[PDB]
Design a protein around this ligand. Structure first.
Ligand SMILES: *[C@@H]1O[C@H](CO)[C@@H](O[C@@H]2O[C@H](CO)[C@@H](O)[C@H](O)[C@H]2NC(C)=O)[C@H](O)[C@H]1NC(C)=O
Ligand SMILES: CC(=O)N[C@@H]1[C@@H](O)[C@H](O)[C@@H](CO)O[C@H]1O
Ligand SMILES: OC[C@H]1O[C@H](O)[C@H](O)[C@@H](O)[C@H]1O
Ligand SMILES: OC[C@H]1O[C@H](O)[C@H](O)[C@@H](O)[C@H]1O
Ligand SMILES: [Ca+2]
Ligand SMILES: [Ca+2]
Ligand SMILES: [Ca+2]
Lengths: 214, 218, 217
């Protein structure tokens, strides 16, 4: 019955990025990171990597509730991301920065995750544009997986083989919750990787995933 | 009714016992709430920080409308916004402090007895009081009584465009001895005077690690 | 003991604040204080009262500064001796100390009990048994000892350890740890005047990160 999105806050004159309280579909308050600069601002950031201070190789219960720090890296929580994206349409933007401070991005028409009972299934709309290329449409219609809850399409455990948590199939083309392996790495596809961007052997300095009413 | 009971400046906050720097809501003269960064640590504390550079994560080469409303992040770097800075300095007398740190941990500062920014109709004209003291030396008096300029709105006193030439936004004259909204060029640069430069401090070829501009009632 | 709102960061965690960051708690008879909650480390629910991370803040401060606290929520701070006593008195608050080096290697110590008494009583450190910690014990030595600053010599050394080692601490024969020391950025030739944990990295290495925190045992 007040601000429901970061877009609402932007329209009310909140021009600086930072943490604000919004009110979810059910009226539950949630303190979220608003990106008010990028691409018109008004984005609610649900994932952020910047320096490798936080361990992202976490189990189901931890990804469900969210983890990390307001002062740095975090995953907002799958329950929260479902609430955020349940009804209406949120467009997704992915922002990626390499160690030479070059920026890439990918933008999708719509994005949402189902509730826990449906394994926080990815529901993704068309790739609109992005200098990072499209490395997420591959994962469309897939259950989320973590090390202790394998819902993927591999005989082995993708979350373990690539040290992350994602909507793994057999196995991935993106892996943003992968290990903070600074820049080029010999090890295959176990960093913060975006196949169509810098490839399976380059772990980004910065990663942000964010949503805005479409 | 929290406008009448709420703090109106960072100094009110310090007086109420907030001893750590951090973002707090204050109430502007027209009762509009604004979340600002208070500096409680430096020089007696109670300063409202309106510009901060720290790591080059935010692009400061922005247009008139963006400087007007403010941009950046409470997580790090930002410009509070010219409308806000006018609102903060329109009434009474605010002193100004500039804190600068180089990449070798050398701290420098400059202090001015008063600092006032006019409204948009006057293009955010700078009215600067006397230089008080400072190891950074005085690189702002030169800019007294100049309109603010951005790349897309040239209000400087140069035949060309200072904001474009020096890749920032400032109360440019013809053109500058300070350029704190310049590019984050990380230490010494070969390019001329287009970084976070304070001439009397580290010169036209050295871009500071940290910049903060802040005001306090005096 | 507040029953109207959150008393500790532990309370906040059990209420569903799962991200670390600055929150408001209600101290014991029942004043508000905005504190840094660490919700990830060792199960979460830690209230952080010291933090070093980048050397932006001068920790070589006098008695009155350490009393009321200083620093910034954006980085380095000391919560204030008055706040720390109000927070820990009794209690049985678990003390934890987190330490990180310049190649991102993690160490950290834990203690079963922690409190400082009020100003009258020199904010004496009262420490319970060391429990565990890959950093080793460099705080027990300092048990039952006055806090000292540059303008308040309360150690057992003929000189002033605070000036000699450039900080503030529960110095005695001097120190075995110096977390409020100078941010000397890794290895240093100057002796023991840095953010040092003798059992961890000794008197010649200044840590990159250092956090002292508490949670109800
Ligand atoms: C600020 O600068 C303006 C120019 O933009 C100054 O205006 C001039 O002031 C002188 C007297 O000092 C007059 O003789 C001129 O005719 C004025 N010119 C214009 C264009 O108005 C103004 O005086 C300055 N104000 C201060 C406080 O220094
Ligand atoms: C609606 C439909 O029949 N299409 C497919 C369905 O067959 C499949 O079971 C599901 C998950 O794989 O993804 C749907 O898009
Ligand atoms: O430009 C300001 C900057 O602030 C924070 O770092 C946000 O996470 C970024 O997306 C950006 O908004
Ligand atoms: O002052 C208004 C005017 O300012 C500059 O020229 C900018 O390009 C716009 O903000 C424009 O409308
Ligand atoms: Ca499998
Ligand atoms: Ca011009
Ligand atoms: Ca002595």
């Amino acid at each position: 019955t007040g601000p429901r999105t970061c877009k609402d806050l932007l329209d009310r004159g909140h021009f600086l990025s930072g943490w604000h309280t919004i009110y979810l579909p059910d009226c539950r308050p949630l303190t979220v990171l608003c990106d008010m600069d990028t691409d018109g601002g008004g984005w609610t950031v649900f994932q952020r990597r910047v320096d490798g201070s936080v361990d992202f190789y976490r189990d189901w219960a931890t990804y469900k509730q969210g983890f990390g720090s307001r002062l740095g890296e975090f995953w907002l929580g799958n329950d929260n991301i479902h609430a955020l994206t349940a009804q209406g349409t949120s467009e997704l933007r992915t922002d990626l920065v390499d160690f030479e401070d070059n920026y890439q991005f990918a933008k999708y028409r719509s994005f949402k995750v189902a509730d826990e009972a449906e394994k926080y299934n990815l529901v993704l709309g068309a790739f609109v544009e992005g200098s990072a290329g499209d490395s997420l449409t591959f994962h469309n219609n897939q259950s989320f997986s973590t090390k202790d809850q394998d819902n993927d399409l591999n005989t082995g455990n993708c979350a373990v083989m690539f040290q992350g948590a994602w909507w793994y199939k057999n196995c991935h083309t993106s892996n943003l919750n992968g290990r903070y392996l600074r820049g080029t790495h010999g090890s295959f596809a176990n960093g913060i990787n975006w196949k169509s961007g810098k490839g399976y052997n380059y772990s980004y300095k910065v990663s942000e995933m964010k949503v805005r009413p479409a």
